[PDB]
Each structure stands twice: as structure tokens, then as C-alpha cells.
Amino acid sequence: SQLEIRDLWASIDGETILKGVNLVVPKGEVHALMGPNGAGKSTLGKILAGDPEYTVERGEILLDGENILELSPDERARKGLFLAFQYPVVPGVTIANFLRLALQAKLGREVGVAEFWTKVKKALELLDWDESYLSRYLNEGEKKRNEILQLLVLEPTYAVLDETDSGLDIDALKVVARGVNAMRGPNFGALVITHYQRILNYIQPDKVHVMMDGRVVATGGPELALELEAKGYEWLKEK
Numbered sequence: 229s230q231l232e233i234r235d236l237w238a239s240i241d242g243e244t245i246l247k248g249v250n251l252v253v254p255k256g257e258v259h260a261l262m263g264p265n266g267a268g269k270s271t272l273g274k275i276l277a278g279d280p281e282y283t284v285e286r287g288e289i290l291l292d293g294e295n296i297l298e299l300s301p302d303e304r305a306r307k308g309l310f311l312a313f314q315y316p317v318v319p320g321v322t323i324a325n326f327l328r329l330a331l332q333a334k335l336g337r338e339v340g341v342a343e344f345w346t347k348v349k350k351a352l353e354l355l356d357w358d359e360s361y362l363s364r365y366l367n368e369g370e371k372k373r374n375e376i377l378q379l380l381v382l383e384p385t386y387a388v389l390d391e392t393d394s395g396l397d398i399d400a401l402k403v404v405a406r407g408v409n410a411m412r413g414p415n416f417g418a419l420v421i422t423h424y425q426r427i428l429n430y431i432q433p434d435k436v437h438v439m440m441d442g443r444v445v446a447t448g449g450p451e452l453a454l455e456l457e458a459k460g461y462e463w464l465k466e467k
């Protein structure tokens with residue numbers, strides 16, 4: 229019934245970056261994780277993904293009751309954690325073909341044209357996007373659109389979306405919001421990681437967690453993100 233990070237301690241290149249992270253996202257809710265850059269929010273996202281460069285010293289990550297820290301990235305996706313499929317530079321690959329490859333990898337079986345197009349059509353309807361988009365080639369903002377189509381088609385139970393790399397690029401933030409809002413429901417939970425409050429005007433969070441010095445130092449409703457945007461992180465560090 230929830231995605232939970234419990235007493236998580238982690239380090240990289242021999243240095244402790246996460247210092248006892250406790251963060252729970254109930255299935256059915258969309259939460260935000262904010263914080264100064266380098267204070268741990270993005271490192272948490274990489275550890276959730278299963279980035280092997282990190283060493284977990286203590287803690288657990290439970291997805292609906294099961295500890296996934298020992299699972300490979302592929303195994304976590306099999307348990308319902310969103311893992312976008314990555315592709316290189318390569319010419320002549322339509323978004324449609326790529327999505328079919330991504331869905332077949334996630335499902336562990338072939339997916340026929342009927343199942344594929346029925347699912348794609350539903351996703352396009354929810355996103356209010358034209359089917360012609362699927363004819364675009366990979367590598368022809370844009371990377372975000374492709375990931376959002378995967379979000380709707382792969383139907384993960386939980387998704388951790390780090391949008392720090394979008395900054396204040398409104399188009400990119402809105403594409404992700406369209407996808408997250410389209411997935412909202414009793415069977416989906418999400419954690420949106422961001423430095424700026426901007427995206428939260430498009431994706432209203434049920435709860436906001438703020439991370440400083442490797443741990444969550446404050447939580448609240450959307451108003452907390454608003455006050456942080458108005459006053460700055462230094463204000464919160466003090467009180």
C-alpha cells in the first residue's frame with residue numbers, strides 16, 4: 229500500500245551522503261521531494277533506481293511490503309517501480325517500435341499489434357496527443373516526452389521522477405505534469421524530485437518532503453513548497 233524509504237544511510241566515493249532518510253509515499257498519492265542541490269534528493273532517486281555506484285550502509289526500501297534494495301533495476305521494475313528504457317544516439321527507430329520494445333521487456337513476452345496499439349491509443353487519449361507522434365524517430369523536452377509515453381504504457385505502480393534537470397523549462401515541466409496527472413489514481417503513487425517549486429503548480433502534491441544534509445528535515449502540504457519558493461532554502465534551514 230506504499231513505497232517506503234526506511235532509515236536509509238548511503239555513501240559514494242567513500243563519503244556518506246544519505247543520513248537516515250525516512251520517506252513514505254502511499255499508493256494513490258503524489259508527493260514532492262525538494263531540497264538544495266547536493267543535499268541528497270537526487271542521490272536518493274539514483275539509489276531507488278538501483279545505481280550500483282552507491283553503497284547502502286543501513287536501511288530498507290519497501291515496495292508494497294517487500295525490500296527491493298537487493299533487487300536489480302530490472303527486478304524492481306518487475307515489482308512495479310518505473311524504469312524507463314534507454315536507447316543510444318541510432319537512426320531509423322520509430323517511437324512506436326521503441327515503445328513496443330520497452331513494453332515487451334517490462335512484460336517478459338511478445339506483445340502483439342492489437343495489445344500494443346490498444347494500450348498506445350489509450351495513453352494518447354489520456355495525454356491528448358496525436359498518433360502521428362509515434363512515427364517520429366528516436367533522437368530526431370523530447371527525451372521527456374518519450375519517457376512520459378513509457379510511463380503511461382508500462383503502467384508502473386510507483387514512479388520516481390527527478391525533474392531537477394529540467395530547471396524552469398516550462399514546456400518540459402508541463403509534459404511531465406500531464407503524464408503524472410494522467411496516471412493519478414488508487415493504483416499509482418509518485419515522488420517528484422525537484423529543486424524549484426515551479427512544477428508543483430502543474431502537479432499538485434499531497435505532501436512535500438524537504439531534504440537537507442542527507443535527511444528529511446521538514447514535511448508539509450503544498451504550502452510548504454510555496455513558502456520555500458518565496459523565501460528560499462536558507463530560510464527553512466533556520467526555521
Ligand SMILES: [Cl-]
Nearest residue numbers: 268269270271
Ligand atoms: Cl543530491
